[PDB]
Amino acid sequence: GIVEQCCTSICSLYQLENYCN
Amino acid sequence: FVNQHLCGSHLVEALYLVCGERGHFYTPKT
């Protein structure tokens, strides 16, 4: 789940797009 | 925004700025 990478380290546009609707 | 150690509200803002007016499924408790 997103919090295991993007609250602990960096989310970037190409990773963030994976959680787009 | 710019690539950094996001979380919570900043992560919701980043997801909105990437995905656009469409919206996204990650919306945490605050």
Side-chain angles (χ1 to χ4, degrees):
Chain A
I2 190 174
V3 181
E4 201 66 71
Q5 181 174 103
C6 293
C7 270
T8 51
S9 193
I10 302 197
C11 238
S12 301
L13 62 99
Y14 48 82
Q15 277 296 97
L16 285 168
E17 196 175 83
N18 301 327
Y19 321 99
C20 187
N21 68 359
Chain B
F1 81 105
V2 183
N3 304 329
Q4 71 190 263
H5 297 287
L6 299 174
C7 190
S9 50
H10 219 152
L11 214 187
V12 167
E13 292 277 273
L15 281 173
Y16 169 74
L17 287 169
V18 173
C19 191
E21 193 173 85
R22 279 168 64 172
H24 59 80
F25 56 76
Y26 169 78
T27 51
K29 280 178 179 180
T30 54

